[PDB]
Amino acid sequence: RIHLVTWENRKLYRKVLERYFRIRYDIYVKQRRWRAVARPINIEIDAFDNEHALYVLALDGKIVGGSRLVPTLEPHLMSEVFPILAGGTPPRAAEIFEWTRFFVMPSGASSPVAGFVLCGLLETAQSLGIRQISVVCETFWPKRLRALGWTLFELGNALEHPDGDIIALLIDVTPEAIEQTRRAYGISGAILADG
């Protein structure tokens, strides 16, 4: 199930968040991803992990995948690091949040966990009146996401690097995108823990 962790419920979710920041150490620091900062303790945390962050976490209590949303009216990765990808002016609106830190844990084999996370992201954004989601992602993502039902707009030129090519996208959060995604991964029950 997809759980929405915010500033307001961070104390209820304190053990999940402590595991979540340790997991980011395993994923981002331990496999030496671009710009991950090594901390003196085994967590990974960046300038965008503050009171304005939203954590969309796939649980079962073990974390199996997730993502992070930041209000585009606040400083965000595309605004502070990659504004060149959106022509120097990333999209910024109350209605618009930036997606960062998409991950799926290895275990999670032939599992729709990815499905559960991607569908859960759109459903959480729906529920909050986030109408679009901005993202900096590898240049292979738009094909995959336009195969699941997503309507999205490239915001610029790809930035080519020997270690990976990246691009900025603006994603519509549509009832349709949601349906086709569920269909692509064929799962049924409730996904969000709404209560």
TrEMBL record:
Species of origin: Mesorhizobium sp. ORS 3359
Protein name: Autoinducer synthesis protein
Top-level taxon of the source organism: Bacteria
